[PDB]
Write a protein that binds this ligand. Structure first.
Ligand code: UDP
Ligand code: UDP
Ligand code: FRU
Ligand code: FRU
Ligand code: K
Ligand code: K
Lengths: 781, 781
């Protein structure tokens, strides 16, 4: 095909010196090409997998991705027959040259985390992505099988295990596998005799004699299965046994959760800058976590009272909010509190809200302050530390290091994918977004943590056609700063997919009448349909009978609300069928946020340009989740739909909330919602990059729904069952806890290999992050 | 006996907050202590081995050193019986409180190389320090024994191995151990029948066909020993065989040696600032090396022409010298050239000489520039790269990385031992000396290199009583910068002692009349005994018939010549017995160097203070080694002595020079000269810290020599033998080449494990050295 293949690069040439993405790629090349396309041979086809290609003079470089998590880079001659296979670094060189004009100084930093991971083998099966604990178990199960030097670690573990000055599992009486083996067998013979429901307290005395401390279970039956479980790990370890035992051992009692940025609170917040899905997730998480812990604790026959602290910034000048108080009990829980610590410098505490992009210079000092405070509140040290987002993961990493605690991170979003080419173009973005800091923190926490939780597969490995969020951090470069050769690997056994949900008593199907909160209908109707225009709501709905196209979200550039508004403004077919109600931004107060401010000015203009008055209602931030639920269900009444038009959406809780209430959802294909929604079944995908087709798809739906109302009900059911299956909080907590067990034990076995990695990070943090963070200007009060 | 320990303890407090070296440690407390000492026993015996004590009001910190390379740190209450065991970091914590007032920032950097060096096991025996290649051999020999995965590296090594386009050893025809085991078997059988003296050209045809390329030997006898060796490695590897095979394989053809600082030349230099032994060491070295390479290349049946390039700086404005010319042929060699590259910045070439303490900002660009130039001179890339000193090892590490070459380093001195407490006190020393740059380069190069060469065992592990030059780098801290927890380990298998010598054509026994160069006797006599005072010589020797107490060196603080002069001045008994002749500094010109200037003023005042005219002759730098040779022998004629009063001397070539000419020698006891000399047998040690005692020691020797002139001869003959035994250039080259063979191969077996350390080291150059090096103010023409 030397004729045909020439013809492609040919088209590529004129395109000039620039970034070739996939769409921006052959979508130009192939579809602008004649019947000569005829490419169903290898060249077009296998290289339909080109993720991006670097356009320069006689060479063009391109990154290819046959399968998720598998990359190969190539350099093909602009005019020539030659293709030479590039190394990751060589490829990244191109990107550097394209911006600065030259590559990075030869001796300028190159991060390679590859050699530091080598402890466990790396699974190559797509199946094991986001499944690592499964993999880790098979590795431990196999390494444990008849190996002395291997088993000791497990015995040392149970012997050292204690909480608040009480011994658990094995006592000091057991010095070796022989006594342990002998004692367990000795215990088993005894217990197999007793009535199943016999309380531990009965056989406690004897158990203390032979070296068994509390926590095996609350009764004979339970203690029995457990002793039988461990005896088995000593004898013939299998992965399922190993997990079950480790997950059962009472461990997690105290938990520390990190969420520094935003206005973190239970009221009067949601919709403010940086306040949103993260805050929601965390409050649901702790409540779900606390129920599971009280249980595991009670089943294991212990009386410890758990504690969960959520750490965040104390903001003294936020008014209307509880953000200025140090300690706050979380709704519907006994043991979960929000702990607030202030940011400070040499000159004293900093009062004013700071954007999440600007917090960096404060975090290290924050970390120390937090350690002191959370130490005051906890009886015992943290049994698990979970970081959230970047600041959260950064701080949680420093703390876990400092307190030697099992650490888990949860990204909630990765900015590198929200802001396209923000890595290569970072320099000009930097005075505003400080991405050099963020990406640094992101890499550091990502490799520092023990395990990683994600809400979907796509967060990790993306899909067959497109690349996942974490995966996009495998190899990248920030020209002038440093180059990341292997930053992360999609196959890492630390990745674990644990899907969240929507609080089921906030969000239920709109069709359950007795449950509908009808006291909210008066206000909901003023909200939507009233003729008043003010800071709460702008414009007016001229027609109250139409279905409502609805969206609710934080207002910023990536949420792309102004985009939706344009698509709708322009589409008369859609405008005639539905009213557009957009909730975003708080216009009650002058916005302090750059993007929100910008985004708001667009909304105003679009109102004027498309003469949107009468079909459009623009609603400020809706902060009560409880009424929020009813809002969703109310839209169902009108037979409307939810739309999520983000340019990228990391997960999309609102998409999960809508589906739970029975509201048919059209959500962006870029990011998490691609995995949540099964197209034509659980909802529909739209592409924010083709807005007019999104608008038309919506129109198609309402049109079909008009002629056949069963169509609406179909998707509503599809959505409801799709949540029932994938997204709920019941499985979450347990999975999370089991993980703490397996990854905690793993710490001790894998201990000494992570020493090298522990220094690389320590040094990366110190020599790279700190100086960058310090560079970021301080806020002035 | 807590009444006693508390005695010495409170004895120590009176000193206050500060450092105490063993000098002071047992000096002040203990025998300067009241006879209540009566110690012996425990707590004296072992803790007389205390190396340093950090004194903070409630506590004292103790670095304890039972055996070379073995360290224990202890905190003990200034008042109390309490003695706790500090881990190294904890002890480093102390020193930091002593200076900054607080310990280093919690998240401030700890350099730890230990976890990276875990690749090979650690020898614990005193006998392997500086013997590392011996240990590596037995390790490789075992790992190699019936290991397919182990043997393959060797086959690959031999297969890929080539030079200048020509294939060596194995050809591509041998892909596996069986084929090779088979080919070698045919080969031995064939050659076995042949006449030993048969040339390789005869069987060259036969060999090529079975896959055997050149380099096994010049004739059949040599080739047969060689093929047998390999057969034996594949069958039953032993260390001695391994060493012999690897040492013998032709490898080193192009050698590159880095020495950027100083005025490096063959004439009109020695004695200038920064120009000294390192220049002598190298010139002597390369000449020996070339001779050996020529030999080896021939024995293996090769026609390759070697090249040895000494990279150093090109100095356009040094007049009276050749420093301004790019390429210079080394005296009395066919293949060794000095290659000069200029320092430069954006503004163009930097003309002026820069002190070795200031070259840091220019080193990276130098590396880039050098790579190009040497690549223009060398035919084929460098086979071995040898760094010298700090700038030299720094640059040589960058090149080695860049071009993929076996690297060796030679320190020639380590500033941290020469400038005591410069690590802990660095910040105040930095504007002047920039030790925050140099200590960084040292740590880096020292861990980056493949193998390290030293001139003595003291350079590495010191003695029973005192710490070594490298060993002092194991644990230290630069408060406010970083903290090296494990920075080096004297048992590290990379250490190899290979002792240098004096050019035997330049320096020989003064008793060989035939050889004495008499045509210099006129100059020498004007130089010593002349009536004239000028830039060339100061004061006057009133009596030409006395013995001369001679010394020669660069003029700087540590060389401590102003002290020798003072000791001499105070001592009337010594002044009567001998004339003091000191060579140092060049007064022909205004002086650019700080210490040299400082040191000259001291010299002047001293001459006036002690009325040194008539006893003392202060001569300027003597830059022609050949006449220097005679001058030594002339001092022998007067029946005098050589004295080396350094506060610290890393090695001391002039000591070896003096001894070799048969001039009895008194050398400092702090440094290499401690090992070079056997007190009373090959010369005498003097303590630069007690000079009044040193002057008296000299007085004694000169007195004894009057009553019994044969005393002199005894030491002279003594020193001579000591040299013919321990220090000469014959074995040096042979050993260097063998180490290059083994470590070269060793790097392929160990390549994978070193990968982490590779990255950690890269990150350190990039985020620590680079920034520091840029902070150094540029030379401005
Ligand atoms: O004015 C608002 C804006 C957002 N939310 C809630 O904030 C979350 C938005 O999270 P999502 O994951 O959808 O987007 P994110 O904020 O995480 O980027 C959802 O629970 C919304 O219901 C809200 O209650 N009121
Ligand atoms: O005025 C001088 C001073 C020194 N040297 C030579 O320089 C070297 C000094 O080497 P050494 O190791 O003793 O001291 P270094 O300068 O290396 O620290 C010796 O060869 C000396 O003979 C010299 O030729 N003329
Ligand atoms: O990136 C999305 C943003 O919204 C949040 O979910 C906060 O509610 C955070 O993850 C981040 O500030
Ligand atoms: O500290 C020793 C100094 O003298 C030299 O030997 C002469 O080049 C170098 O090693 C260094 O400048
Ligand atoms: K226990
Ligand atoms: K070869």
């Amino acid at each position: 095909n030397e004729v045909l293949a020439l013809l492609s690069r040919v088209e590529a040439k004129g395109k000039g010196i620039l970034q070739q993405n996939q769409i921006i790629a052959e979508f130009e090349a192939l579809p602008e090409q004649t019947r000569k396309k005829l490419e169903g041979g290898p060249f077009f086809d296998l290289l339909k997998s080109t993720q991006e290609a670097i356009v320069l003079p006689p060479w063009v470089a391109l990154a290819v991705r046959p399968r998720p998590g598998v990359w190969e880079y190539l350099r093909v001659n602009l005019h020539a027959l030659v293709v030479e296979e590039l190394q990751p670094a060589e490829f990244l060189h191109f990107k550097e040259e394209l911006v600065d004009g030259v590559k990075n100084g030869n001796f300028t930093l190159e991060l390679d985390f590859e050699p530091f991971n080598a402890s466990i083998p790396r699974p190559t099966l797509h199946k094991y992505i986001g499944n690592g604990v499964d993999f880790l178990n098979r590795h431990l199960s196999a390494k444990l099988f008849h190996d002395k030097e291997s088993l000791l670690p497990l015995l040392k573990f149970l012997r050292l295990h204690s909480h608040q000055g009480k011994n658990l599992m094995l006592s000091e009486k057991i010095q070796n596998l022989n006594t342990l083996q002998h004692t367990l067998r000795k215990a088993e013979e005894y217990l197999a005799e007793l009535k199943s429901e016999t309380l531990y307290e009965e056989f406690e005395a004897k158990f203390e004699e032979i070296g068994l401390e509390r926590g095996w279970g609350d009764n004979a039956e339970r203690v029995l299965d457990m002793i039988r479980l461990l005896l088995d790990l000593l004898e013939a370890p299998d992965p399922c046994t190993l997990e079950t035992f480790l997950g059962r051992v009472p461990m997690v009692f105290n938990v520390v959760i990190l969420s520094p940025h935003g206005y973190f609170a239970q009221d009067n917040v949601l919709g403010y800058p940086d306040t949103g899905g993260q805050v929601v997730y965390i409050l649901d998480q702790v409540r779900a976590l606390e129920i599971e812990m009280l249980q595991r604790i009670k089943q294991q026959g212990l009386n410890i009272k758990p504690r969960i602290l959520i750490l965040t910034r104390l903001l003294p000048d936020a008014v209307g909010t509880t953000c200025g108080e140090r300690l706050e009990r979380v709704y519907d829980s006994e043991y979960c509190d929000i702990l607030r610590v202030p940011f400070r410098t040499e000159k004293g505490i900093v009062r004013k809200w700071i954007s999440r992009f600007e917090v960096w210079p404060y975090l290290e000092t924050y970390t120390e302050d937090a350690a002191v405070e959370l130490s005051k509140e906890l009886n015992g040290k943290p049994d698990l530390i979970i970081g959230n987002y970047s600041d959260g993961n950064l701080v949680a990493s420093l703390l876990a290091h400092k307190l030697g605690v099992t650490q888990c991170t949860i990204a909630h979003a990765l900015e590198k994918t929200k802001y396209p080419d923000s890595d290569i173009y970072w320099k000009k973005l930097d005075d505003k977004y400080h991405f050099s800091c963020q990406f640094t923190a992101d890499i550091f926490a990502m490799n520092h943590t023990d395990f990683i939780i994600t809400s979907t597969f796509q967060e990790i490995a993306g899909s067959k056609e497109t690349v996942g969020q974490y995966e996009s951090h495998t190899a990248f470069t920030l020209p002038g700063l440093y180059r990341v050769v292997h930053g992360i690997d999609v196959f890492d056994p630390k990745f674990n997919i644990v899907s969240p949900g929507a609080d089921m008593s906030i969000y239920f199907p709109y069709t359950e009448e007795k449950r509908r909160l009808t006291k909210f209908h008066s206000e909901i109707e003023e909200l939507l349909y009233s003729d008043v225009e003010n800071k709460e709501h702008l414009c007016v709905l001229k027609d109250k009978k139409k279905p409502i196209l609805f969206t609710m979200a934080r207002l910023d550039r990536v949420k792309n609300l102004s985009g939706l508004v344009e698509w709708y403004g322009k589409n008369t077919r859609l405008r005639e069928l539905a009213n557009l109600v957009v909730v975003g931004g708080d216009r009650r107060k002058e916005s302090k946020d750059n993007e929100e401010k910008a985004e708001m000015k667009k909304m105003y203009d679009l109102i004027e340009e498309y003469k949107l008055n009468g079909q459009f209602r623009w609603i400020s931030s809706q902060m009560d989740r409880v009424r929020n639920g009813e809002l969703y269900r109310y839209i169902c009444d009108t037979k409307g739909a939810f739309v999520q038009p983000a340019l990228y959406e990391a997960f999309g809780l609102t998409v999960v909330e809508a589906m739970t209430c029975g509201l048919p959802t059209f959500a962006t294909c870029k990011g998490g919602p691609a995995e949540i929604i099964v197209h034509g079944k659980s909802g529909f995908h739209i592409d924010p990059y083709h807005g007019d087709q999104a608008a038309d798809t919506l129109a198609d739906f309402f049109t079909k729904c008009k002629e056949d109302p069963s169509h609406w009900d179909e998707i509503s059911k599809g959505g409801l069952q799709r949540i029932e299956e994938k997204y709920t909080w019941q499985i979450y907590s347990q999975r999370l806890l089991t993980l703490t067990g397996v990854y905690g034990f793993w710490k001790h076995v894998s201990n000494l290999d992570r020493l090298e990695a522990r220094r690389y990070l320590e040094m990366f943090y110190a020599l790279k992050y700190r100086p960058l963070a310090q560079a970021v200007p301080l806020a002035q009060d």
